[PDB]
Amino acid sequence: PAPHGGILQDLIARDALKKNELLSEAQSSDILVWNLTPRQLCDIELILNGGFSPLTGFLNENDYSSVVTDSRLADGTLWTIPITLDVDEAFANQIKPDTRIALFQDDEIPIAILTVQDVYKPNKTIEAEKVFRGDPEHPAISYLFNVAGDYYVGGSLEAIQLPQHYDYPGLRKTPAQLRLEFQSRQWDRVVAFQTRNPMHRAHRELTVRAAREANAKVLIHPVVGLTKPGDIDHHTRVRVYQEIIKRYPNGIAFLSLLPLAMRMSGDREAVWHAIIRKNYGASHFIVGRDHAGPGKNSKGVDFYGPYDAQELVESYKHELDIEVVPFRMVTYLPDEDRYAPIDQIDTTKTRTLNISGTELRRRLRVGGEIPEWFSYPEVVKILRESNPPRPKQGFSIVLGNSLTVSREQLSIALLSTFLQFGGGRYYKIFEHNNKTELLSLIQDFIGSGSGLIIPNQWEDDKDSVVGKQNVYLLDTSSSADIQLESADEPISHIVQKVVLFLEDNGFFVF
Amino acid sequence: PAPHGGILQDLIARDALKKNELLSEAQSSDILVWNLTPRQLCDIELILNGGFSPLTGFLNENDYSSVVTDSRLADGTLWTIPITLDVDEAFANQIKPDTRIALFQDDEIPIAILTVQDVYKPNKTIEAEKVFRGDPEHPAISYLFNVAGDYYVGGSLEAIQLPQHYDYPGLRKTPAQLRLEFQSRQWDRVVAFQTRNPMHRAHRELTVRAAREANAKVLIHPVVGLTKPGDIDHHTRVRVYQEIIKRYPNGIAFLSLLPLAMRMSGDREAVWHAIIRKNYGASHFIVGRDHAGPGKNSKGVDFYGPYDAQELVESYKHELDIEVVPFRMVTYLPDEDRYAPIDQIDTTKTRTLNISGTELRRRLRVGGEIPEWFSYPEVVKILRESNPPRPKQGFSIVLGNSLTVSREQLSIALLSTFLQFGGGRYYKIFEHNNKTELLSLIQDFIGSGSGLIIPNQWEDDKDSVVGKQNVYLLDTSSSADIQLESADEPISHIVQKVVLFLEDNGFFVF
Ligand SMILES: Nc1ncnc2c1ncn2[C@@H]1O[C@H](COP(=O)(O)OS(=O)(=O)O)[C@@H](O)[C@H]1O
Ligand SMILES: Nc1ncnc2c1ncn2[C@@H]1O[C@H](COP(=O)(O)OS(=O)(=O)O)[C@@H](O)[C@H]1O
Ligand SMILES: [O-][Cl+2]([O-])[O-]
Ligand SMILES: [O-][Cl+2]([O-])[O-]
Ligand SMILES: [Ca+2]
Ligand SMILES: [Ca+2]
Ligand SMILES: [Ca+2]
Ligand SMILES: [Ca+2]
Ligand SMILES: [Ca+2]
Ligand SMILES: [Ca+2]
Ligand SMILES: [Mg+2]
Ligand SMILES: [Mg+2]
Ligand code: NA
Ligand code: NA
Ligand code: NA
Ligand code: NA
Ligand code: NA
Ligand code: NA
Ligand code: NA
Ligand code: NA
Ligand code: NA
Ligand code: NA
Ligand code: NA
Ligand code: NA
């Protein structure tokens, strides 16, 4: 289909002969420089390559507010997610309209030149409520208030080069390249499948059914840009996709990585996704249950209805110009060994089965066996390998402030004790001295599977530098993960308490 | 490197705007038509896509004889394999210079328009001796005298479309497409590996070493056009390649199918291969032991020296304009579990190991276990599956002419007898009635694993319609595979003889 807006805005192609000139202006000591934030790098790449056609820069206030209140650009073009360049007051104050800024990656690689159209201070509450539905726990809203700059800079781009990536060089196909890919193959019907999770059996069936319904080839188009916090890293997912792609009949599917930065914005994002895939050459786009939805909030309520995206996408149907293949909860059928849309069964006459991602983590974290029917073995293997069960996980024991015994001796006692268990885990008494350069390493070790014995707490002003993950507090306090009887409880007693606690939580298995 | 001759002769690109017109001329009832032979289809495809740059048609006598006697085109361009359009006297007589011929595929798809330059009658003995070294058993020589036409038609081409392929649509990259592939990846150093056999451990190591030595990315560029008779089919090989490519570090290798029609011409072919790989975008080309060599003749002598190709390629080194990475016999080192070039070991101080393809077929045909060190398991699995051991192979027992017993009853006896063994093999008394439409099916069944009981021989004039493979003659004659005592030997006796013979050759296992 025609790219959204009618013209693929591949600015790398457009500005090619200006490459050298733009590069010189980018490195000239007079120009103002902004180092792109991670999410911005994702966005900037989708704007420069045509993925966000018709966009050609970051939204000015006029287009931005139109998108917030109208799900459309100022000119009426259907567009649901605001793409802006968020900066801080300091930087915002050094720019005026007509100014030209150099956009860098890693304060070293010049990406593009942005020509300023305006500098405004968005009402984050409105954006949060009109675009992401208001819940403070919604991922997009948390980013907007805790990570995003309080100033937006609308303006047009002139491309120097897409953001730098040293991984999967062959796979991050640009809209132009994908289209060429489909052509060399004479693929004129392609149904794209969005995703941010590893694909399991349900999804393989889901995508093949779509392939069959639409009479089209399959495009696994996963996000490797930025997804829901706590998601499986894209490296692991890529390995999973590459593995599962082999279970498709020869020549039916194509894999391409999309450096998109999701907002986990349910229905609106679904619309945005469809526009994006259309630019990339797809003729069909799947929209299953709770598409781009972040699940439930701490209170158990849904951020979006499991089918809000489908309804919204349906309502813009006549102007999306890319056919949407909707799917209802695809689930497992024990008695018949096969999956099927829940909309075409049940009646109690048929018994289903469904292993939610929740419980999926649970078995991964507990070395539990994951059903042959649920996911392919090679896939589960890759997953366990990246997310090991507790007996292979790292952790830390922090000797609480209330601790009266010799921290030096209690430390050694724990070390020598853990050491006798064996099991390949590396242990260390780790003294941080409140130096963030040391604190920031704590999660590295835990990530590496090591067990750390930390003799002292770190000041509360530093608590943010340390990832709470697998970090237990040994103390008399009620807020201690491992509660002691008294601050001066004898070492061997404290030791047994720590060991049995770790054993209870699966870190040790005898 | 620059394509050979300086200009990539991608005629599909060149003649694009003449597509419709050429197509009309091609299907006009007045034009003369030649249906391309299989090898010609391979050649025509490499000529139209630039693979044979600087060629732009089939060699006229002047260029042809220059290649035969000078390893160069008439203008001096280094070129070792003659590419000609061979036809029969009947067709040859209907054409003169300036004439335009339509070249079709399957007497249905028009491929190109050849403008005739000349029609000559090559002296096949000179070509055979100067180009392929003269031995009547050499694959290229045999083709030249038994399959090739006795007339060549020199002339220029105008492309309509590359020959049609329905398998591996994505993988048969053209020189233009490959180059783009390498670019999108920013690959400016690429060492290409030629091959017509499945790749085993030695090869994987051989190619990685070359990647390391040349500081270049790896291009597995296998031939799926036409190779040495009796080779493993390309479908099985492609499955093997796609499987083995996964053993390379992520993003170090790329796979592309080359529809080349080999001549198994040792050293000359190696030169030709290097020229072809250069056109396809490679900066380096591997030339190992006995490259493009057809082994030994029936008398046990070598068609080429194990390193003739290396020497020939070395002598044209300064004008190939593509760097050659030579390799000596790469072999296995038990005691150290690793492979290495034989040129950097031995001295008896080190013990090697080498499973020749010969003996490899042997185990494949005998269900023997193939060493973990020799090849990856997933690969052997694919091979066994395409080339099953005897107990899963088909066969035929032909009731000899000398037979005096009731052929009807002896047939039934063998059928009932084989039926009681079980083992998934399908059996059938097959009456051919000397009808080639039936005879031509004999090998289809054998290929399908079935056992055939044929009550009568076919007339000697038809013997050629039937593939000798797994076809045994039961007769009193000395030339019978299963020799009978007398023409009237009682059935149970003949039956035991046939059963034990088949058991002895592995078709039956109890
Ligand atoms: N069981 C299912 N039934 C229907 N659709 C599904 C199912 N599971 C996943 N999908 C769809 O698969 C696509 C990607 O799934 P996910 O990676 O879990 O999350 S998403 O944030 O990208 O939507 C979405 O269209 C989603 O709705
Ligand atoms: N053991 C080996 N040592 C060195 N080179 C080898 C070895 N085995 C295969 N090769 C090389 O691998 C390439 C392709 O091998 P093959 O498929 O068997 O045959 S060929 O006909 O394409 O040359 C050639 O360059 C060949 O010389
Ligand atoms: O399915 Cl993934 O959440 O593991
Ligand atoms: O290596 Cl092949 O001859 O099987
Ligand atoms: Ca703020
Ligand atoms: Ca719900
Ligand atoms: Ca006390
Ligand atoms: Ca002849
Ligand atoms: Ca020899
Ligand atoms: Ca007798
Ligand atoms: Mg990039
Ligand atoms: Mg073709
Ligand atoms: Na720096
Ligand atoms: Na409000
Ligand atoms: Na439709
Ligand atoms: Na709703
Ligand atoms: Na349209
Ligand atoms: Na417990
Ligand atoms: Na060159
Ligand atoms: Na026909
Ligand atoms: Na070199
Ligand atoms: Na020699
Ligand atoms: Na040169
Ligand atoms: Na024998």
Tell me, yes or no, whether B199 and B219 share the same domain: yes
Q: Which residues of A are annotated as a binding site for ATP?
A: 194-197, 288-291, 330
Q: Which atom of ligand 2 is nearest to the CA of B328?
A: 4
- Report the C-alpha gap between B273 and B295 in whole angstroms: 18
Half-sphere exposure of A457 (CA within 13 A, CB side): 15
Tokens 């801080």 belong to residue:
A88
Which pair of tokens denotes residue B227? 């190779």
Three-class DSSP category at A238: helix
- State the smallest CA–CA distance between residue B6 and chain A in angstroms: 25
Tell me, yes or no, whether B360 and B452 share the same domain: no
Of the candidates B224, B221, B287, the residue with the CA atom closest to the CA atom of residue B253 = B221
Q: For residue A103, report the distance from its CA to the centre of ligand 13, in Å.
A: 14
Buried b (16+ CB within 10 A) or exposed e, A26-44: beeeeeeebebbebbbbbb
Tell me, yes or no, whether B179 and B204 share the same domain: no
Which pair of tokens denotes residue B37? 């032979």
Of the candidates A394, A403, A461, the residue with the CA atom closest to the CA atom of residue A430 = A394
Q: What positions of A carry a catalytic annotation?
A: 195-197
Residue partners of A382: CB distance under 8 A and separation at least 6 = A198, A236, A239, A240, A243
Compute φ and ψ for A191, nearest 5 degrees: -100, 120
Tell me, yes or no, whether B14 and B132 share the same domain: yes
Considering Cα of B359, then B361, then B366, then B372, what sign does the dihedral take?
A: positive
Tell me, yes or no, whether B356 and B380 share the same domain: yes
- Report the C-alpha gap between A194 and B76 in whole angstroms: 56
Helices B377-386 and B234-244: crossing angle in degrees, nearest 10, is 170
Give the single-character DSSP code of A233: P
- Report the C-alpha gap between A194 and A203 in whole angstroms: 11
The answer to whether A190 touches A284, Cβ cutoff 8 Å, is yes
Tell me, yes or no, whether B440 and B461 share the same domain: yes
- State the smallest CA–CA distance between residue A160 and chain B in angstroms: 16
Tell me, yes or no, whether A345 and A222 share the same domain: yes
Between chains, do A169 and B177 touch, taking CB under 8 Å as contact? no
Which amino acid is located at B74 in the chain? A
Count how many domains chain B has.
Answer: 3
Residue partners of B133: CB distance under 8 A and separation at least 6 = B266, B303, B304
Question: Is residue B189 a known part of a binding site?
Answer: no
How buried is residue A441: exposed, middle or buried, by Cβ count under 10 Å (0-12/13-18/19+)?
A: middle
**Virtual torsion, Cα A171, A173, A178, A184, nearest 10 deg:** -50
Q: Which of A250, A255, A256 to mutate to test the interface with B (most CBs of B within 10 A)?
A: A250
B residues 144-183 closer than 8 Å to A (CB): 168-170, 177, 180-181
- Report the C-alpha gap between A380 and A377 in whole angstroms: 5
The CA–CA distances, whole Å, from A419 to A412, B62, B125 equal 10, 83, 81
Query: Candidates A203, A296, A360: which one to mutate for ligand 1, based on the most atoms within 8 Å of Cβ?
Result: A203
Q: For residue A27, report the distance from its CA to the centre of ligand 13, in Å.
A: 14
Q: For residue A282, report the distance from its CA to the centre of ligand 17, in Å.
A: 12
Q: Which residue of B has its CA nearest to A174?
A: B184
Q: Which of B355, B388, B421 is the last residue of a domain?
A: B388
The CA–CA distances, whole Å, from A434 to A31, A268, B46 equal 39, 44, 68
Residues linked to residue A25 through DSSP beta bridges, in sequence order:
none
The CA–CA distances, whole Å, from B331 to A184, A394, B32, B80, B129 equal 40, 43, 54, 30, 33
Q: Which of B352, B369, B388 is the last residue of a domain?
A: B388
Tell me, yes or no, whether B248 and B338 share the same domain: yes
- Report the C-alpha gap between A217 and B251 in whole angstroms: 25
Between chains, do A251 and B184 touch, taking CB under 8 Å as contact? no
Q: For residue A169, report the distance from its CA to the centre of ligand 18, in Å.
A: 47
Asked whether A198 lines ligand 3 (CB < 6 A), one says: yes
Between chains, do B251 and A169 touch, taking CB under 8 Å as contact? yes
Supply the DSSP string of A314-374, one letter for each residue: HHTHHHH-SEEEE---EEEEGGGTEEEEGGGS-TTTS--B---HHHHHHHHHTTPPP-TTT
The enclosing domain of A476 has a CATH number of 3.40.50.300
Tell me, yes or no, whether A340 and A217 share the same domain: yes
Elucidation method: X-ray
Give the single-character DSSP code of A429: E
- Report the C-alpha gap between B85 and B100 in whole angstroms: 14
The enclosing domain of B119 has a CATH number of 3.10.400.10
Tell me, yes or no, whether A198 and A323 share the same domain: yes
Tell me, yes or no, whether A4 and A147 share the same domain: yes
Q: Does A249 touch chain B (CB under 8 A)?
A: no
Q: Which of B340, B355, B388 is the last residue of a domain?
A: B388
Asked whether B197 lines ligand 4 (CB < 6 A), one says: yes
Considering Cα of A483, then A485, then A488, then A490, what sign does the dihedral take?
A: negative
Measured in whole angstroms, the distance separating CA B226 from the mean position of its chain's CA atoms is 4
- Report the C-alpha gap between A121 and A149 in whole angstroms: 9
Range of the domain at A468: 389-510
Q: Nearest Cβ partner of B169 from A169, A170, A251?
A: A251
Query: Residue A286: in which H helix or E strand, if any?
Result: strand A284-287
Asked whether B206 lines ligand 2 (CB < 6 A), one says: yes
- Report the C-alpha gap between B435 and B222 in whole angstroms: 39
Measured in whole angstroms, the distance separating CA A194 from the mean position of its chain's CA atoms is 13
**Region at A469 (left for phi over 0; alpha for psi -120 to 50; beta for the rest):** beta
- Report the C-alpha gap between A425 and A419 in whole angstroms: 9
- Report the C-alpha gap between A416 and A410 in whole angstroms: 10
Residues of chain B contacting A251 with CB distance shorter than 8 Å: 168-170
Residues of chain B contacting A184 with CB distance shorter than 8 Å: 169-170, 177
- State the smallest CA–CA distance between residue B28 and chain A in angstroms: 27
* Max CA pair span of chain B: 76
The answer to whether A411 touches A399, Cβ cutoff 8 Å, is yes
Residues of chain B contacting A254 with CB distance shorter than 8 Å: 170
Tell me, yes or no, whether A310 and A274 share the same domain: yes
Q: Which of A184, A185, A238 to mutate to test the interface with B (most CBs of B within 10 A)?
A: A184
Half-sphere exposure of B393 (CA within 13 A, CB side): 23
Half-sphere exposure of A188 (CA within 13 A, CB side): 1
SS3 content of chain B, % helix, strand, coil (to 5): 35, 20, 45
The enclosing domain of A263 has a CATH number of 3.40.50.620
SS3 content of chain A, % helix, strand, coil (to 5): 40, 20, 45
Asked whether B202 lines ligand 4 (CB < 6 A), one says: no
